[PDB]
Paper text:
To better understand Cy domain catalysis, here we report the crystal structure of the second Cy domain (Cy2) of yersiniabactin synthetase from the causative agent of the plague, [name]. These structures demonstrate the pseudodimeric fold characteristic of the condensation domain superfamily, which is a two-lobed arrangement of two chloramphenicol acetyltransferase–like folds.
Here, we report the 1.94 Å resolution crystal structure of the Cy2 domain of Ybt synthetase (HMWP2-Cy2), which with its acceptor PCP (HMWP2–PCP2) forms the NRPS half of the NRPS–PKS interface. Two X-ray datasets were obtained for two crystals of HMWP2-Cy2. The first dataset was solved to 1.94 Å resolution by molecular replacement using the structure of the Cy domain from epothilone biosynthesis (EpoB-Cy; 35% sequence identity) as a search model. HMWP2-Cy2 crystallizes in the space group P41212 with one molecule in the asymmetric unit. Electron density maps obtained using the 1.94 Å resolution data permitted building residues Q1483–L1663 of the N-terminal subdomain and N1669–Q1910 of the C-terminal subdomain (HMWP2 numbering) but did not support building the hinge linker between the N- and C-terminal subdomains. The conformation of HMWP2-Cy2 defines an open and continuous tunnel, with a solvent-accessible surface volume of ∼543 Å3. This metal site involves three backbone carbonyl groups (S1520, H1521, and Q1855), a carboxamide (N1621 following the first aspartate of the DXXXXD motif), and two crystallographic waters, giving rise to a distorted octahedral coordination geometry.
Numbering used by the authors: 1483 to 1663, 1669 to 1910
Write the structure that this text describes.
Amino acid sequence: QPFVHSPEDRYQPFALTDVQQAYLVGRQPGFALGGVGSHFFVEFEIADLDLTRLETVWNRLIARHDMLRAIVRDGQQQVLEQTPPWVIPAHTLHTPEEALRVREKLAHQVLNPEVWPVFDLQVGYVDGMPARLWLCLDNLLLDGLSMQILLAELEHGYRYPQQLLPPLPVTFRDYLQQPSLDSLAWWQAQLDDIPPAPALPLRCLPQEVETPRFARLNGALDSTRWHRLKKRAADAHLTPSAVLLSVWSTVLSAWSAQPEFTLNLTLFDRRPLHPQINQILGDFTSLMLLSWHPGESWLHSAQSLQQRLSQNLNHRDVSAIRVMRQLAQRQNVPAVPMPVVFTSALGFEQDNFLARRNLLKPVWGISQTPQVWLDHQIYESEGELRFNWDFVAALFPAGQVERQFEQYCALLNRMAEDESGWQ
Ligand code: NA
């Protein structure tokens, strides 16, 4: 079907996605966590920052991407035609300690989605040190792939400020309006075979965390080992995502009260309704449950997970949001939460995202998701697999997440080197 553009309605309100609605209500106390926002925060270091150049690039991106000018208003989303140019606030800091105090303030700020802008961008000059760029974007409006697109454009524009990009020919607003946007029956069919989320040890009731604060652990698998592990995956009839999911679930099983459990998978692939759809910013998130049922050998367990994954992917028009409701109705409980999440940006041609030699050098970051305890996020860059776990640190016993991360990194590396554990 041909894409239907409605430029005369470009600035009219439009409906929020299911994911966006969940984020907004996740600002309030819920079944699995206190209220929290949904933003993504990164600190970059820039040698010899040219503020005027950065401001030009950023304002071009605001003009280029409708969803940077979006707000939530009267229960819907809306793109603002004209917004005041962003004049970047700059702080003068005399020590790295002073800059850390600013980072801490900005990384945990609350973006009000009702008042433009639903982002923040400030800089900090530190005497005799690289300047800092503190960037805050909201997953309420820009999904993970959108944030990779936008950050790559920000790097590219700052490096090559003379290049002008032609306007985008398709909008997120119009995408959501397309017609294309028994799967429900297929999901209802196996409500009895979806086990609860991982029953991980907690140091308190998660509902009793009034102001959840996220922390991050990050790692990488070097490009030689990641190539080798992808090859071994192929030889064992597993996608790379299935291998990573199975390695992670092995660690989670070892800590959980029950060895079988369900994860919520966050995916970003877009329906191919316009040839340039992968170039725009918006919320294209899909959520999909996937259960881990360990068997005799890791390999058998991974192969069962891959088969389940392949089938489930065929039914993502029914969201995990809906399935969790069906699960709670079937089980006669108020809610069935899925607070342990796996988020994959593999496969989206964002090669060399955050490439080592980037002028905007990422040095620190954190992300929040309401009603989530632990989010394992992955992406590929410069041939390496890069990953981070974002988690509510206060929920878990001291040292627990750090130890699980240590075990996960060790197992990942060993399985990339050592053929033994592939049965
Ligand atoms: Na977020």
